[PDB]
Design a protein around this ligand. Sequence first.
Ligand SMILES: [Mn+2]
Ligand SMILES: [Mn+2]
Length: 178
Amino acid sequence: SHMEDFVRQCFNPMIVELAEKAMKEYGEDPKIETNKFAATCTHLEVCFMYSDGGSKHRFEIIEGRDRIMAWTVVNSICNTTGVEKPKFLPDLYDYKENRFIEIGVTRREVHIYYLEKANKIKSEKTHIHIFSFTGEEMATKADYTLDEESRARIKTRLFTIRQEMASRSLWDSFRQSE
Ligand SMILES: [Mn+2]
Ligand SMILES: [Mn+2]
């Protein structure tokens, strides 16, 4: 398919392999559910740009690790700091603010996905931060964790990926697939 070739020539190889591993590891094949393949790569790259923002060792990356190793690091962070173990695996831990962070990338408005994720949490201790493909963002207690410039970089990247998909006439099915 067109989407698979585009994902491979758009994102960096480390990201593509981690996305492939994470999808097969949960029974989905990147060569078929190509829209979910693009979205796993996007979520991965956004998470890595986020963790790059801030100081050197501010964020402990949870996403991208294998399941049991990811939970190993959460349990370790929990017994280290004293925070409660979330029931669902988050994406980061903020050592500066002492909180796990769930990062989301949606194509249906910051209000809809923020509302869904906040209801999914049902344990309000986990900080939530949503980006969209339209430049908009919404975050818990309006606390956006990073400075304006890092978030603006993430947003720019998201919009460049959106235009690249449309240039290949892939954007439409991708926006309707979420
Ligand atoms: Mn995740
Ligand atoms: Mn996430």
